[PDB]
Design a protein around this ligand. Structure first.
Ligand code: ZN
Ligand code: ZN
Lengths: 60, 125, 116
């Protein structure tokens, strides 16, 4: 996705392809109640003593 | 001879399921009418492959620009089911673990008429 | 314990408690109906002032599939013997004075819950 999205304009790819490929998702405040949300990709999804180990989403 | 050769296209890019033949083609169709005729004067196909791993689908000098994105709700087998055998003789081929993500587009137009009319009539006498 | 609502048999209405004068027994009559049925409980109305509630009766087993809910491997189940369990506090209004935790076994077709 980063490779297709870096090469946008030089090809037709866009944000809506991340949506359509199921990579990113619009989450409502009322649905944000139920997410188990990470704050960076790596740093929160590594292996330690466990915080959750059930993350559903990450911040952009 | 077998590879990823399945190709979804939108409504406005609907290619004929059969080769072009003069005995199968007819004149029925006509900004309004501009989009109408395109359905059969364009839509045999050559999916051109590029050094970046993108694909371009050509039915003219117009281009559809394509990526071989994965699929997970549609994990079928593709097969040429021709009516010949017992009840459609499906010949085996590629499995639907990927399908095209790609861009094919349209446009709109503009209008203009009038606002209100005259008034203040008066009968004789 | 408690008393339930016991419904009429004719009108399907709510039965009142009624003492039988001149057999000295406890009945259940109707308002709408003329339906007399014979009590068994000998108990009319109850009231828990302490409001003593066990939370394990309110806990559903469906909690275990909560992504947002901490997971341990230090308390195993007692029926099956699974290692995983989720845990949460009473999650209730009217919690008297307790920060007691509650566990549910994280294994399908079990839904065993316990408190330590
Ligand atoms: Zn009744
Ligand atoms: Zn268990």
């Amino acid at each position: 996705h980063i490779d297709q999205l870096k090469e946008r304009e030089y090809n037709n790819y866009s944000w809506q392809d991340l949506v359509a490929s199921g990579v990113v998702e619009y989450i409502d405040t009322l649905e944000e109640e139920t997410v188990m949300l990470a704050m960076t990709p790596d740093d929160l999804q590594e292996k330690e003593v466990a915080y959750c180990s059930t993350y559903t989403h990450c911040e952009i | 001879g077998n590879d990823l050769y399945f190709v979804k296209l939108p409504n406005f890019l609907s290619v004929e399921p059969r080769p072009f033949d003069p005995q199968y083609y007819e004149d029925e169709f006509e900004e309004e009418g501009r989009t109408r005729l395109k359905l059969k004067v364009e839509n045999n196909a050559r999916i051109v492959k590029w050094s970046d791993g993108s694909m371009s689908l050509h039915l003219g000098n117009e281009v559809f620009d394509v990526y071989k994105a994965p699929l997970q709700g549609d994990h079928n087998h593709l097969f040429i089911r021709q009516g010949t055998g017992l009840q459609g003789q499906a010949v085996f081929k590629t499995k639907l673990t990927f399908r095209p993500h790609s861009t094919d587009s349209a446009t709109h137009r503009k209008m203009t008429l009038s606002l209100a009319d005259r008034c203040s009539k008066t009968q004789k006498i | 314990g408690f008393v339930g609502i016991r419904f009429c048999q004719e009108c399907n209405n709510m039965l009142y408690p009624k003492e039988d004068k001149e057999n000295r027994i406890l009945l259940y009559a109707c308002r709408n109906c003329d339906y007399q049925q014979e009590a068994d409980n000998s108990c009319i109305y109850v009231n828990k002032i302490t409001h003593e509630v066990d939370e394990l009766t309110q806990i559903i087993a469906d909690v275990s599939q909560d992504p947002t809910l901490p997971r341990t491997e230090d308390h195993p189940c007692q029926k099956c013997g699974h290692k995983e369990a989720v845990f949460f506090q009473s999650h209730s209004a009217r919690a008297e004075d307790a920060m007691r935790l509650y566990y549910v076994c994280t294994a399908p077709h079990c839904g065993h819950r316990w408190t330590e």
